[PDB]
């Protein structure tokens, strides 16, 4: 997995067309949406993760949330991302590590937004200008 | 070298504090800036990149133009961005690479624009919902 971390004054979207043939299913509330003053991931699920999902969502939760302690942000948003790599995760486990993730930050006490895997988005955000508020992280289970 | 295609309706940016000790000498002009209607160009230099920085820029001169074509966009930005690789290459020739690329747009009639390298920048985007707004390409040189 690779993450990349933007800590943001805000980050909006309106899903599009479909990207895949088999998306992930959408209600209506889901096509658009908006947070503000939030950390946005980005996330890479790789072809690496599908030895263990479980370990390597447990590993991202867990790196997602100190990035969010330090920044101090209590809103976090999973951003379905493909062009963080090449080696790229079947699209089935890609949805559940990006849903494994979505939860498990959830459990963790923060409010959390996310947008549906497989379309096309439309998306703005603003990334504050800060040391700590453009980050990245590769993320993988151990062999 | 990994490029981030955007097709957006603006991109925006404000250069903050410095990232590197040694980073890309700016003018005051050059620590704000804005287009609109444009196809931002997120690049990582990497390693590879520096067996033939030539060679590379050229190859990549080429396929953002190919991209903006397509997207049929007048304005290119070129967005220096880290994050899409671990291989990166020496700063030196990273913005070696960066400023070839930058000036062989302007060379084939684009209208240009550019962010400094080396420092952290606040910036704001807004992708077009559209199947080519949104694109990765991984450009290296021949070995």
Same mark, same amino acid.
């Given at each position: 997995?690779?993450?990349? *971390?933007?800590?943001?004054?805000?980050?909006?979207?309106?899903?599009?067309?479909?990207?895949?043939?088999?998306?992930?299913?959408?209600?209506?509330?889901?096509? +658009?949406? +908006?947070?503000?003053?939030?950390?946005?991931?980005?996330?890479?699920?790789?072809?690496?993760?599908?030895?263990?999902?479980?370990?390597?969502?447990?590993?991202?939760?867990?790196?997602?949330?100190?990035?969010?302690?330090?920044?101090?942000?209590?809103?976090?948003?999973?951003?379905?991302?493909?062009?963080?790599?090449?080696?790229?995760?079947?699209?089935?486990?890609?949805?559940?590590?990006?849903? +494994?993730?979505?939860?498990?930050?959830?459990?963790?006490?923060?409010?959390?937004?996310?947008?549906?895997?497989?379309?096309?988005?439309?998306?703005?955000?603003?990334?504050?200008?800060?040391? *700590?508020?453009?980050?990245? +992280?590769?993320?993988?289970?151990?062999?």
């Amino acid at each position: 997995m690779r993450v990349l *971390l933007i800590h943001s004054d805000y980050i909006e979207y309106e899903v599009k067309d479909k990207a895949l043939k088999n998306p992930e299913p959408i209600s209506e509330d889901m096509k +658009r949406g +908006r947070m503000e003053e939030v950390l946005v991931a980005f996330i890479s699920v790789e072809k690496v993760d599908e030895k263990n999902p479980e370990e390597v969502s447990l590993k991202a939760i867990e790196e997602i949330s100190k990035v969010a302690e330090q920044v101090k942000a209590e809103n976090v948003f999973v951003y379905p991302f493909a062009h963080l790599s090449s080696e790229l995760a079947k699209p089935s486990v890609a949805m559940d590590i990006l849903n +494994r993730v979505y939860q498990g930050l959830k459990e963790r006490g923060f409010n959390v937004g996310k947008a549906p895997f497989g379309y096309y988005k439309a998306f703005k955000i603003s990334c504050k200008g800060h040391p *700590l508020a453009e980050l990245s +992280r590769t993320i993988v289970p151990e062999e």
